[PDB]
Amino acid sequence: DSVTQTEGQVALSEEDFLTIHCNYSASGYPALFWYVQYPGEGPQFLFRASRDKEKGSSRGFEATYNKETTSFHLQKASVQESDSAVYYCALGDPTGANTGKLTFGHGTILRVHPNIQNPDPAVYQLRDSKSSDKSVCLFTDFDSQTNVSQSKDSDVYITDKCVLDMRSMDFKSNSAVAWSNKSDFACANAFNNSIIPEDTFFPSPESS
Amino acid sequence: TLLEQNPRWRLVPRGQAVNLRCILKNSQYPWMSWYQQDLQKQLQWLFTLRSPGDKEVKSLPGADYLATRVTDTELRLQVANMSQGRTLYCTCSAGRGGYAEQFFGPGTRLTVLEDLKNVFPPEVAVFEPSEAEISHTQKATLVCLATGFYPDHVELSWWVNGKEVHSGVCTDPQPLKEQPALNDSRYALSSRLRVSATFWQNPRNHFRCQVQFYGLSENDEWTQDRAKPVTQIVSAEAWGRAD
Numbered sequence: 001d002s003v004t005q006t007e008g009q010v011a012l013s014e015e016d017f018l019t020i021h022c023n024y025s026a027s028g029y030p031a032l033f034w035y036v037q038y039p040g041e042g043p044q045f046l047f048r049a050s051r052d053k054e055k056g057s058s059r060g061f062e063a064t065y066n067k068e069t070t071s072f073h074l075q076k077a078s079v080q081e082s083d084s085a086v087y088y089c090a091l092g093d094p095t096g097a098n099t100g101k102l103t104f105g106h107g108t109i110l111r112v113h114p115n116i117q118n119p120d121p122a123v124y125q126l127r128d129s130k131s132s133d134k135s136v137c138l139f140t141d142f143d144s145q146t147n148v149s150q151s152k153d154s155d156v157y158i159t160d161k162c163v164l165d166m167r168s169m170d171f172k173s174n175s176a177v178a179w180s181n182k183s184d185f186a187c188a189n190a191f192n193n194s195i196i197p198e199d200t201f202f203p204s205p206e207s208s
Numbered sequence: 209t210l211l212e213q214n215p216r217w218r219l220v221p222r223g224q225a226v227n228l229r230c231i232l233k234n235s236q237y238p239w240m241s242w243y244q245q246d247l248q249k250q251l252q253w254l255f256t257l258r259s260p261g262d263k264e265v266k267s268l269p270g271a272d273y274l275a276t277r278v279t280d281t282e283l284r285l286q287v288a289n290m291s292q293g294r295t296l297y298c299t300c301s302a303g304r305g306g307y308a309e310q311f312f313g314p315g316t317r318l319t320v321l322e323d324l325k326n327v328f329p330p331e332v333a334v335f336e337p338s339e340a341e342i343s344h345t346q347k348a349t350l351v352c353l354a355t356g357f358y359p360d361h362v363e364l365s366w367w368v369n370g371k372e373v374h375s376g377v378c379t380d381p382q383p384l385k386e387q388p389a390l391n392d393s394r395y396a397l398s399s400r401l402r403v404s405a406t407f408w409q410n411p412r413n414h415f416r417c418q419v420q421f422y423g424l425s426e427n428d429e430w431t432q433d434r435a436k437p438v439t440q441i442v443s444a445e446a447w448g449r450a451d
Contacts, residue, residue, distance in 0.1 A: 031307075041314075097304075102305045124341045127335065131333050157396055164400055166403075175378060205338075
């Protein structure tokens with residue numbers, strides 16, 4: 001008995017149409033399931049179907065059991081950021097005989113990136129005092145179609161882009177961070193190894 | 209909730225055992241199972257055990273397992289040898305696998321160490337908003353760096369005037385390796401807190417980046433001279449600069 005969810009990753013904008021493929025290779029009349037795993041938590045049940053054309057639904061997701069192409073594809077009309085998770089297809093025996101087991105797919109990572117309506121790319125330099133030998137550079141307020149590359153330099157550390165939402169003001173921003181325990185580190189070299197927008201703003205520090 | 213497991217997390221030195229507990233707090237689903245989760249994030253069924261006193265044995269890539277249904281509301285897992293980290297999920301159901309469905313508990317995360325004197329707690333640093341960001345955007349991005357920990361089990365949190373904040377925050381999904389390739393590498397982690405500039409500019413306002421490091425237990429074989437890298441909270445803090 002086998003389950004395939006062909007795709008390892010899926011990246012999507014807020015409000016994009018989603019479909020995740022689930023095909024099985026079984027020799028009974030197997031029951032099928034969807035589970036979701038959010039970061040930090042254990043899997044959570046979504047729904048079950050066991051007969052051809054039975055449709056299962058929860059939280060704006062839907063799937064329909066399709067005996068002809070042996071499929072239980074997961075679908076959602078409009079994904080939002082909070083749907084970022086790992087979706088697991090599984091199958092087992094409805095019968096009570098037995099093993100007691102579910103077979104799980106490899107699972108599919110869903111990353112929903114937000115729609116940044118007022119881009120404003122900038123790299124800024126901050127500072128400490130209280131320890132670090134260091135200085136960090138903050139690349140922020142870019143578009144979701146920017147990718148942040150890991151460094152060519154091994155003494156430099158660069159994080160992947162990451163979204164923060166200030167509720168209260170309906171604002172979402174991407175940010176990535178760069179730092180180095182050394183000299184030779186200015187904020188206009190920081191993200192050299194990423195393709196950044198032509199119009200990225202590099203303001204200077206201090207005063208006169 | 210309807211299943212409580214213990215321990216929640218555990219450090220285990222290579223080729224050594226640990227006992228796991230799961231208790232079922234509702235007989236509407238009186239089948240219990242064990243499921244492991246790989247570090248490649250695969251879910252594999254280990255056991256389903258219905259009736260008190262039945263025991264089952266299994267050997268997998270990375271661990272040997274003894275499963276035991278002691279009572280109608282107690283499942284136990286012994287996990288021996290164990291070269292690879294995993295999460296172990298207890299699950300209950302109204303039947304079988306298929307007949308009705310599985311409901312996963314909170315899990316036990318088991319981290320494996322080949323040695324024990326690679327273990328280090330994080331250094332934590334806070335970085336205050338740039339003056340240029342404040343003037344371009346009238347927003348203020350603090351950054352927090354957790355550097356030099358091993359192994360990778362840190363939870364990071366922002367606290368503003370004593371209260372835990374969630375809004376405006378973005379922590380890296382997983383940490384990254386400082387000595388990238390080096391099977392006992394140390395990790396760094398990054399997080400971001402963004403408030404309006406006027407929020408930062410108030411010197412009443414207090415900001416703490418806080419890291420919970422899970423490391424060496426109650427007592428463990430600490431032959432070294434340096435301080436014991438126990439479970440602990442390392443913090444760094446800044447004040448609002450009306451500047």
